Paper text:
The COMMD (Copper Metabolism Murr1 (Mouse U2af1-rs1 region 1) Domain) proteins are highly conserved in metazoans and unicellular protozoa. There are ten family members that play key roles in intracellular trafficking and in the regulation of transcription. A hallmark of the COMMD family members is a highly conserved C-terminal sequence of ~70–80 amino acids called the COMM domain, which has no known structure. The N-terminal domain of these proteins, which we refer to as the HN (helical N-terminal) domain, is more variable in sequence across the ten proteins, and is proposed to ascribe unique functions to the different family members.
Numbering used by the authors:
A (entry chain E): 3 to 112
B (entry chain B): 1 to 108
C (entry chain A): 1 to 115
The structure:
Amino acid sequence: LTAEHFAALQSLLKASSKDVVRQLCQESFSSSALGLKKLLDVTCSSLSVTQEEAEELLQALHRMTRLVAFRDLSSAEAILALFPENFHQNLKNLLTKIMLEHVSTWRTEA
Amino acid sequence: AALTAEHFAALQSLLKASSKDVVRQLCQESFSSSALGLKKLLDVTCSSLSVTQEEAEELLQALHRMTRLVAFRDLSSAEAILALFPENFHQNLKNLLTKIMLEHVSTW
Amino acid sequence: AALTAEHFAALQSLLKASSKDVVRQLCQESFSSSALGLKKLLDVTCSSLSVTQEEAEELLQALHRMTRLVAFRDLSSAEAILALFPENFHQNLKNLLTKIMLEHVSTWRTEAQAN
């Protein structure tokens, strides 16, 4: 949403001074917790999925990526092991591949 | 900062916990949670601007996207940054925001 | 904690992708997300205490402001931390919390002095 985004920036005209918006822009950047909305919109636009349904996937990816990093998994057949037997094979292998390529760099981010 | 009465009322929920270890975990996780330090920013925005809590989010989500695009493209120009704003946008507001982001594109 | 059935069902939406690049891009940004780590924290809080999302959110915001306040003001004594709680506050919880934060105050200060 970039059209109704500028319709939100206009609310800055309800401010009291140029000092409050000066401290409001500084707090809008460093607070990276607001980056989730950009992640949701880019997920809904790339997968043609609902906002509520995009939240379920992102939590799943977060949960699994954190998991393979926590246990420090370098084994391919170990990654494949936690996938259920009735899981889409090509997607299972695609994920497994991505897990292996980033399991090193991800663990450093802790 | 300080602790409000609502905060102490919220803390008492820990008496519902099954063990003292859960209480210990929740404390550690709450301190380390960077995302939690935004409920105050959400409240400040919603109070000093007299908007909805939802409307407060929409502004912060939009402001974050804007201040991110300033560093993502490293716009050093004071005019090309105002090009992002549409023609039907408040003149004095699009002149103020581009005057701050241009001064905060370095440490970004 | 392992993945649930609902979790694997959610993963299958990745098949709706237009390229393998957006899938790996999704994996990277889902991992390095503080917001996603918080919603996981909310879920177990709601689970353990048998509370709602709102009630759990309040507690975590409460615990966040208090634990940070302890580290910021450097309250390295039980008497100083006990001074924060009102008189009508539950005594046993008052003692448990002031014990927990008297242990981590030193490790919390250092953690904040970094970032």
